[PDB]
Amino acid sequence: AHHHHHHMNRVLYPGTFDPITKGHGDLIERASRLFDHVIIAVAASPKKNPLFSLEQRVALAQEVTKHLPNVEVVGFSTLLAHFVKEQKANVFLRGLRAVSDFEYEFQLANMNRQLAPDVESMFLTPSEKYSFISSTLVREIAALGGDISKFVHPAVADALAERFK
Amino acid sequence: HHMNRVLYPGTFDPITKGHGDLIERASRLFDHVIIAVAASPKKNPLFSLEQRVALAQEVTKHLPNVEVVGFSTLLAHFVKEQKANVFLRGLRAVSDFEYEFQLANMNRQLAPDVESMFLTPSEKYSFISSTLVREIAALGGDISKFVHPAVADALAERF
Numbered sequence A: 001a002h003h004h005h006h007h008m009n010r011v012l013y014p015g016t017f018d019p020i021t022k023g024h025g026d027l028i029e030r031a032s033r034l035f036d037h038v039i040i041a042v043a044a045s046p047k048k049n050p051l052f053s054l055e056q057r058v059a060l061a062q063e064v065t066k067h068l069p070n071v072e073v074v075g076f077s078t079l080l081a082h083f084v085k086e087q088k089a090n091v092f093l094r095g096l097r098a099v100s101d102f103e104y105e106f107q108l109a110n111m112n113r114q115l116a117p118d119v120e121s122m123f124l125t126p127s128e129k130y131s132f133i134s135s136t137l138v139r140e141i142a143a144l145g146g147d148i149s150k151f152v153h154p155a156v157a158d159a160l161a162e163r164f165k
Numbered sequence B: 001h002h003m004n005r006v007l008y009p010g011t012f013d014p015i016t017k018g019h020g021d022l023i024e025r026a027s028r029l030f031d032h033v034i035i036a037v038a039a040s041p042k043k044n045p046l047f048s049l050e051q052r053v054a055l056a057q058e059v060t061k062h063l064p065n066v067e068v069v070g071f072s073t074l075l076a077h078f079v080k081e082q083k084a085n086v087f088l089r090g091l092r093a094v095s096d097f098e099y100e101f102q103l104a105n106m107n108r109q110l111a112p113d114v115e116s117m118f119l120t121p122s123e124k125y126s127f128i129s130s131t132l133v134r135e136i137a138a139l140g141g142d143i144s145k146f147v148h149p150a151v152a153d154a155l156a157e158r159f
């Protein structure tokens, strides 16, 4: 089956975003210009014991992206393969970086294709300037009182400052 | 809305079921897919550019929105001639990741408004190598599991 009008893709960008970084933000900007709708899907990830609560991670992601006209931020505690269908999304968006865990990305892709075969797995690459930022290293630098303003949006930096003192 | 145009560059010597699987997925996702067949003279392609173009067309002729064009120029210049805003690349577990990042990053310098986008083909086809297809064919091996029937016939005729 096919049609000849504009294909409206709804792209879902899943992650823990603990916290969202300039790396994520750069990727979201690029996705926003390329696609019709972009859904930031913040997973509970309770077994990752996130520093920030789910609602706060969602709130930070919304604040970082509120200026974009076609971006929505939603938290979810369920299986990604089911959530993507609840969200009527047809593409998984993932960040691809020189330091990405390539082995893990392909197990994730192959397995979600088994669970949701009609949802495409797609990778964008972030700016070289931000491609090496790690959410984990941001938390560790912040807890030891490091300047994280170069890695995260100012609101995330403030949330981190309040979080540790 | 407007019709976005997506460019899928490569040498396609020859196009394989791996490329074909990626093209099918791109076809469902995007308004217009342009298969950009690069001349690639320093790779000494087995097939001429015209032959590579013709096979890619024959293999994708059934799709609603896929067009095949050969080019000898700089990819960063060709994409603007073709009015495309996306480079589409195949990402596989055995992909040459170091090369893909140098390529995407250098083209980002030359054509900043063109995104590099990676799709994954079906697991069943992700390990096919154009080079290994040529070598198997030159030695009279069965390549029907790796390429479209039109491509298999052309490889046998060449050898």
Ligand SMILES: CC(C)(COP(=O)(O)OP(=O)(O)OC[C@H]1O[C@@H](n2cnc3c(N)ncnc32)[C@H](O)[C@@H]1O)[C@@H](O)C(=O)NCCC(=O)NCCS
Binding pocket: A014, A015, A016, A017, A018, A021, A022, A023, A024, A027, A043, A077, A078, A079, A080, A081, A093, A094, A095, A096, A097, A100, A108, A111, A112, A126, A130, A131, A132, A133, A134, A135
């Ligand atoms: C949430 C999932 C996808 C794990 O993702 P992850 O932990 O890696 O999230 P993280 O916040 O680290 O990053 C998310 C995305 O941003 C990308 N990106 C990440 N870091 C950067 C960075 N500096 N710069 C640019 N882009 C980046 C990542 O590659 C990823 O695409 C997975 O655990 C999941 O699907 N959870 C939902 C529950 C579920 O369904 N589990 C079964 C999974 S099959």
Ligand SMILES: CC(C)(COP(=O)(O)OP(=O)(O)OC[C@H]1O[C@@H](n2cnc3c(N)ncnc32)[C@H](O)[C@@H]1O)[C@@H](O)C(=O)NCCC(=O)NCCS
Binding pocket: B009, B010, B011, B012, B013, B016, B017, B018, B019, B022, B038, B073, B074, B075, B076, B088, B089, B090, B091, B092, B103, B106, B107, B121, B125, B126, B127, B128, B129, B130
């Ligand atoms: C043609 C270019 C893009 C190189 O592409 P490449 O050498 O990888 O050709 P090849 O046919 O092997 O593959 C092309 C594309 O198919 C993808 N794909 C390749 N193999 C497979 C496979 N089994 N399965 C699924 N997908 C695949 C590749 O990842 C790539 O995206 C590059 O040399 C180029 O830009 N040429 C134009 C002139 C130019 O601009 N040169 C300067 C370099 S910027």
Ligand SMILES: [Ca+2]
Binding pocket: A002, A003, A004, B064
């Ligand atoms: Ca039609």
Ligand SMILES: [Cl-]
Binding pocket: A134, A135, A136, A137
């Ligand atoms: Cl991390």
Ligand SMILES: [Cl-]
Binding pocket: B110, B111, B112, B113, B114
């Ligand atoms: Cl450009």
Ligand SMILES: [Cl-]
Binding pocket: B129, B130, B131, B132
């Ligand atoms: Cl090859």
